[PDB]
Design a protein around this ligand. Structure first.
Ligand SMILES: CN(C)c1cccc2c(S(=O)(=O)NCCOP(=O)(O)OP(=O)(O)OC[C@H]3O[C@@H](n4ccc(N)nc4=O)[C@H](O)[C@@H]3O)cccc12
Ligand SMILES: CN(C)c1cccc2c(S(=O)(=O)NCCOP(=O)(O)OP(=O)(O)OC[C@H]3O[C@@H](n4ccc(N)nc4=O)[C@H](O)[C@@H]3O)cccc12
Ligand SMILES: CN(C)c1cccc2c(S(=O)(=O)NCCOP(=O)(O)OP(=O)(O)OC[C@H]3O[C@@H](n4ccc(N)nc4=O)[C@H](O)[C@@H]3O)cccc12
Ligand SMILES: CC(C)=CCC/C(C)=C/COP(=O)(O)OP(=O)(O)O
Ligand SMILES: [Zn+2]
Ligand SMILES: [Zn+2]
Ligand SMILES: [Zn+2]
Lengths: 159, 159, 159
């Protein structure tokens, strides 16, 4: 038994029109998220946290621009594939915690469904998955409504 | 024995006049912190880290706007209550680490008293509580003196 | 056996001309990093994460402005000294994960050499050291090319 820590961080800019996808959940909003991907900043930060704990340790690094298959690419696919590769190295899940940093939209109603998705994608109990949100009280690029940031931490177990 | 990780992040804007309260400590400063609460960004980030490790996992989520009891609400009360609920789920403390992000005021002289407070409120040794500060070298909303940010991580143990 | 968590965060502003030093690696770039030090924001964030896990828990706190010895001070020296002191308290390394937040320059080619340096300086295997990079998609002070930020987490073991 041995435990390993990981940390992830991601940002996307608002652009065009909604909805956005956060933690796998389609959330109504006036603006959309600019990206190659989903624009799922929650699942990107989480993915990086998991890869970092297993020392693998980018999504850039274990997917270099394939591009495409990949416009509106499903970030849940990225998450599950990253997870397969982490498990092949012998790791199992301790727990994850995710912090969405956004002035808006309101994340709280969608968090239980985010957790369902993440727990499915990682093959764990929901009690191993926490998600929260915070505003930056109108400060910074998140505060001015210019984009959304997310942080994530992960704990991994190896037999 | 099982260990669990949590992460917290908070921001408050400066507004009106001092002092501010950070980690429970009254710190002299030209501006105050705008909020419902203390405006304790250190103890809010910590509280979220502890709740996230126990998967509980917002302060919004286990206190929805009561509001009030709550103008100038004591963030130490929030911390202790969050802690009671975490312990009722069977968790004990591993350790916590807190990073205050502020251009000013200087946090270093007040850190030992912050640690006394936090350790009391969590019923642990002081060696289980670390607090630090950093500036952003005049960059961003913290750098321009517009507000204060804080990050926190926590490790939890379950029997 | 007991595990301990730490978190670090650092920022430096661009100023004058390159190169910069990140994770010990000299990276060509049009601007340099303003500081007393290296300006190594990666190794500063890491150092703080390690000190925070051992509750020690600033680089300000266990080096107050000596200043100098210290213009263009080698951040790897700071890292190794912080590490000596952490080991003297009885801690050994679990693992570390580092997240460089920069719009530019590109970090990916230099990451393997960063890991060599960090692993040498901490006397561990390279599999215990992860480093990644992310942009903020043109948002915030990192996005406008005004500076570089870095986050780090660390897991410590005590016999
Ligand atoms: C599996 N499938 C189908 C996929 C689903 C969803 C997304 C996929 C993607 S992706 O393009 O959406 N990957 C997430 C997008 O990366 P990001 O939001 O983190 O952007 P960023 O530019 O920050 O990162 C790109 C890479 O550049 C590198 N980088 C970043 C900054 C910097 N200063 N230096 C760097 O080297 C680093 O390795 C980083 O991973 C790629 C491949 C398969 C995907
Ligand atoms: C126990 N007592 C008495 C208390 C003491 C101190 C503070 C208390 C408080 S509080 O109001 O000070 N809670 C901390 C303030 O929250 P915050 O500084 O994190 O503000 P923010 O707006 O970021 O968070 C509010 C909630 O909105 C949610 N949110 C945030 C952003 C977003 N995009 N979506 C969301 O759903 C999320 O759940 C978050 O917890 C409430 C109840 C009892 C308190
Ligand atoms: C060992 N050798 C030789 C060394 C090598 C490389 C760097 C060294 C350095 S250093 O100057 O480069 N230390 C890193 C620079 O600190 P920083 O980039 O974190 O700057 P910042 O201003 O954020 O931090 C300074 C200190 O002020 C304190 N602080 C910060 C903000 C705030 N609001 N209050 C505070 O008290 C806190 O303790 C913090 O450590 C000092 C001594 C020996 C060094
Ligand atoms: C604590 C962390 C993770 C900080 C880095 C996040 C970031 C890119 C902030 C940028 O500036 P800002 O948005 O804070 O201020 P501004 O955009 O107004 O200059
Ligand atoms: Zn992304
Ligand atoms: Zn708050
Ligand atoms: Zn620094």
């Amino acid at each position: 038994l041995e435990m390993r820590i990981g940390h992830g961080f991601d940002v996307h800019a608002f652009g065009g029109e909604g909805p956005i996808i956060i933690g796998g959940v389609r959330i109504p909003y006036e603006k959309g998220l600019l990206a190659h991907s989903d624009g799922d900043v929650a699942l990107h930060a989480l993915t990086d946290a998991l890869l970092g704990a297993a020392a693998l340790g980018d999504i850039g690094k274990l997917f270099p621009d394939t591009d495409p298959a990949f416009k509106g690419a499903d970030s849940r696919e990225l998450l599950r594939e990253a997870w397969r590769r982490i498990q092949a190295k012998g790791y199992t899940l301790g727990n994850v915690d995710v912090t969405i940093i956004a002035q808006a939209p309101k994340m709280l109603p969608h968090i239980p469904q985010m957790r369902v998705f993440i727990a499915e994608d990682l093959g764990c109990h929901m009690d191993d998955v926490n998600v929260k949100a915070t505003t930056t009280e109108k400060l910074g690029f998140t505060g001015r409504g210019e984009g959304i940031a997310c942080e994530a931490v992960a704990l991994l177990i190896k037999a």
